A paper describes a structure:
Mitogen-activated protein kinase kinase kinase kinase 1 (MAP4K1) is a serine/threonine kinase that acts as an immune checkpoint downstream of T-cell receptor stimulation. Through its proline-rich domain, MAP4K1 binds to a diversity of adaptors in hematopoietic cells, including those involved in T-cell receptor (TCR), B-cell receptor, and cytokine-induced signaling. The function of MAP4K1 has been studied most extensively in the context of T-cell activation.
Through iterative structure–activity relationship (SAR) studies, optimization efforts led to the discovery of compound 38 (BAY-405), which is a highly potent and selective inhibitor of MAP4K1. BAY-405 displayed potent activity toward MAP4K1 in biochemical and cellular assays, with a ROCK2 selectivity ratio of 130 in the biochemical assay and an overall selectivity score of S = 0.080 (80%, 1 μM)27 against an external kinase panel consisting of 373 kinases, representing a significant improvement over compound 1 (BAY-755; S = 0.13). BAY-405 was confirmed as an ATP competitive active site inhibitor, as demonstrated by the fact that both kinase inhibitor (IC50 = 11 nM) and ATP binding competition assays (IC50 = 6.2 nM) rendered highly comparable IC50 values, and further supported by a prominent shift in IC50 value in a high ATP kinase activity assay (IC50 = 56 nM at 1 mM ATP). With respect to cellular activity, BAY-405 inhibited phosphorylation of SLP76 with submicromolar activity (IC50 = 0.63 μM). The X-ray structure of BAY-405 in complex with the kinase domain of human MAP4K1 shows an ATP-competitive binding mode, with the pyrrolopyridine anchoring the molecule to the hinge region via two classical hydrogen bonds. The trifluoromethyl-cyclopropyl moiety sits smoothly in the back pocket of the kinase, which remains in a DFG-in conformation. The central fluorinated phenyl ring (A-ring) is arranged perpendicular to the hinge binding heterocycle, with the conformation being stabilized by the o,o-disubstitution. The tip of the nucleotide binding loop folds back into the pocket, allowing for a π–π-stacking interaction of the A-ring with the side chain of Tyr28. While the oxazine moiety engages in a bidentate H-bond with the Asp101 carboxylic acid, the terminal tetrahydropyran ring in the spiro-ring system does not show any direct interactions with the crystallized kinase domain. BAY-405 enhances T-cell immunity and overcomes the suppressive effect of PGE2 and TGFβ.
Numbering used by the authors: 7 to 36, 41 to 157, 174 to 294
The structure:
Amino acid sequence: DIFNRDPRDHYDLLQRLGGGTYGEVFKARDDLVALKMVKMEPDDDVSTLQKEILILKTCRHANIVAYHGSYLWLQKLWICMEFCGAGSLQDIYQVTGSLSELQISYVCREVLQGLAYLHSQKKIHRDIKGANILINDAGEVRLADFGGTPYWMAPEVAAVALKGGYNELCDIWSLGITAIELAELQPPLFDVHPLRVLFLMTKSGYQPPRLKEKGKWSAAFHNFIKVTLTKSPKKRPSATKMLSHQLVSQPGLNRGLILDLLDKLKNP
Ligand SMILES: Fc1cc(NC2=NCC3(CCOCC3)CO2)cc(F)c1Oc1ccnc2[nH]cc(C3(C(F)(F)F)CC3)c12
């Protein structure tokens, strides 16, 4: 059901939230939602999204931003989703400064619960980072679902153009980098040219990154980083396995840690 009704018949529009990497997004009410709007242009064909649309509606979990349905009404696709009033962790840390280890430990647990669920549906997130971890005003954590010609490509080039070949354990690596990003306000190598990073990561002598200040963080955090950032995908622990890790299975982790962060945000 890709409705054609006009969003403005089910929802009142409240404030525009987008810009930057997020594009055009609206706060709205029925229950508060986000409406992301994409301008459909000439050769555009909604039916080519068919595949990546069913992947959304049937992916239902507390730690995954809920997808409520789409609209084409008038040259524009509108995706209606669970509203997260505080935006991304990147929106937040750009104001509050670095998260505490306990805040990061709660975020990691909630993300790993979401990743365990996506991996169970044979979905790979592919884009874990501060910008794609959303926070609601209750301090709860939700993973955001964003996203030349092929006419001459061999079918094996086409397969890679889509998939990659790699598997869901790439999300575990991205979570490690995100944990460092939440601690230090940038991923490792952020000041290094992207091409150079690709080449360096590609060497067999590449050292996985680390937390810069050793003394600031518990051995459990250093160990969480060391194991999430396992070079070999074959020895890298799963989401489910990572959720028994000391850092994320410690008691005291709850949304209070984030309500704190949100107080600090509006009272900086
Ligand atoms: F998470 C969002 C963050 C931002 N932040 C931002 N920082 C700098 C800016 C440039 C400088 O000016 C000020 C803002 C541009 O924007 C903007 C957004 F619109 C965001 O989207 C949502 C917001 C709230 N509930 C949602 N639920 C789902 C979603 C998304 C969907 F919008 F894509 F649907 C993401 C999945 C969603």
